[PDB]
Design a protein around this ligand. Sequence first.
Ligand SMILES: Cc1cc2nc3c(=O)[nH]c(=O)nc-3n(C[C@H](O)[C@H](O)[C@H](O)COP(=O)(O)OP(=O)(O)OC[C@H]3O[C@@H](n4cnc5c(N)ncnc54)[C@H](O)[C@@H]3O)c2cc1C
Ligand SMILES: NC(=O)c1ccc[n+]([C@@H]2O[C@H](COP(=O)([O-])OP(=O)(O)OC[C@H]3O[C@@H](n4cnc5c(N)ncnc54)[C@H](O)[C@@H]3O)[C@@H](O)[C@H]2O)c1
Lengths: 449, 18
Amino acid sequence: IRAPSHVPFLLIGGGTAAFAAARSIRARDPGARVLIVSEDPELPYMRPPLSKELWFSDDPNVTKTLQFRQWNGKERSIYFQPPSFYVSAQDLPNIENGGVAVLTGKKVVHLDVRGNMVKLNDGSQITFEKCLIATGGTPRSLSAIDRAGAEVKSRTTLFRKIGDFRALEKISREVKSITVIGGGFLGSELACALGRKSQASGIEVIQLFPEKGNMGKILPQYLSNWTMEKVKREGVKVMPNAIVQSVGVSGGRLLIKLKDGRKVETDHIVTAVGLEPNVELAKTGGLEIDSDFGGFRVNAELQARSNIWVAGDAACFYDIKLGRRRVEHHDHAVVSGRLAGENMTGAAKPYWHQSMFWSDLGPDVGYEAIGLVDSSLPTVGVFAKATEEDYGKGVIFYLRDKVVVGIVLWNVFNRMPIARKIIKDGEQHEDLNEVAKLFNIHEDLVPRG
Amino acid sequence: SYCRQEGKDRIIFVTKED
Ligand SMILES: Cc1cc2nc3c(=O)[nH]c(=O)nc-3n(C[C@H](O)[C@H](O)[C@H](O)COP(=O)(O)OP(=O)(O)OC[C@H]3O[C@@H](n4cnc5c(N)ncnc54)[C@H](O)[C@@H]3O)c2cc1C
Ligand SMILES: NC(=O)c1ccc[n+]([C@@H]2O[C@H](COP(=O)([O-])OP(=O)(O)OC[C@H]3O[C@@H](n4cnc5c(N)ncnc54)[C@H](O)[C@@H]3O)[C@@H](O)[C@H]2O)c1
């Protein structure tokens, strides 16, 4: 198939961000002609299931069907839409009322900003009227793994793509011990996914990380510790305060020697130690990178230059209330993609509507969260007490200048609107205990996810 | 109203009664 020489809407990076954009473009301006160029050969799909929902599928054909049952009991696929609902790259600049074409297995390798053109890996060039960068990002590798030999390197996976899941699902039924390095969102979610699978398979599940407790970059120590202990229950050997020093191959099995001196024998390793943005095209185009936050530097309306927007994880925008930041969540990729698409069609409206995130670590831990959630800030957790400490349920406020900037709804569900208001308001509330009463914590509420 | 301050993080427990 041949690429169209020109297209009005070019979305570099066929992920969760690109899809929202194209959907929002098609919506705001009907009969749009949108081309998503995606280095990935898979059509746009959502990632959350790959750490959570697809590991709990009873159907053993899950690795092939890539379906799951939503917390509402309805069954769906991780793909945003089926192939039939995309037009072809060939037929895009003709088909009546345009549509969305996805160019699978094609990387943009140069962004000619001045001339409104991209050059593809295969030479073929495509000009655009409006362009969005939605390159997302690639998972960070652990230094120690890089330094080690290719024997150990070959037995180390990272997690992002579909194949990552499909291969680690196999490896879960093969080895006797899997060690996850890193205490991240993903770290924990995989450790708990494998932990639940181990209830039947009996496999050793180890998770080690340098923090004192799980999710130590977004949870305050007490909760962080408590969450670690709840992960433990799901079937995980958790080793906090683990700084890896070197990983060799001892006895046909990977040996992880920590700086504190502890050794760990295991068969396979999965590093979930953070995400690096795919800011490749920055140099080619002369677009700015946030020195502090990483990713492309875009203004309040996710705009970089006259005809270039950025969204998703790759985008470091200016949140008019919370300040400049880059956020790497799923609802963020969607919200920002939506907005970019609006602005591309000419709305020029700023990021006002907040994006959020959620994680579920077993049945005991499930939290929606909004805005500036960063364990380094001062927190005020308000939890429910009974009628030997139970942080089972409550709400945690994140402060900056005596102003709430982030909230974590701890096992409190369907309350995100209320929280959202509190962020908008950014009042200097004398007592946050009152503000907490707004979330009817003690009340059973709804048990989504 | 068990309120206790642990560094930067402040922890308030409450029992529903209002
Ligand atoms: C397993 C997993 C579970 C998650 N669960 C949650 C969750 O529960 N909640 C939550 O809020 N977030 C979650 N996230 C985070 C969220 O899914 C991601 O932030 C989101 O998918 C990023 O979307 P994006 O389009 O910006 O980037 P991506 O989804 O990474 O899409 C980027 C795409 O662009 C392609 N690309 C990159 N560079 C180029 C180039 N130069 N040319 C062409 N194509 C290019 C990439 O290969 C890829 O296809 C999860 C992530 C993972 C990995
Ligand atoms: N619930 C959700 O919203 C969710 C779920 C899954 C994934 N994600 C996203 O997926 C991506 C992957 O997240 P992630 O878990 O890889 O990173 P993360 O950013 O979620 O967590 C970073 C972690 O890196 C670890 N780390 C850093 N350097 C290390 C080192 N030298 N040795 C050991 N550990 C080290 C730390 O323990 C820290 O907890 C991110 O974009 C994240 O937001 C989000």
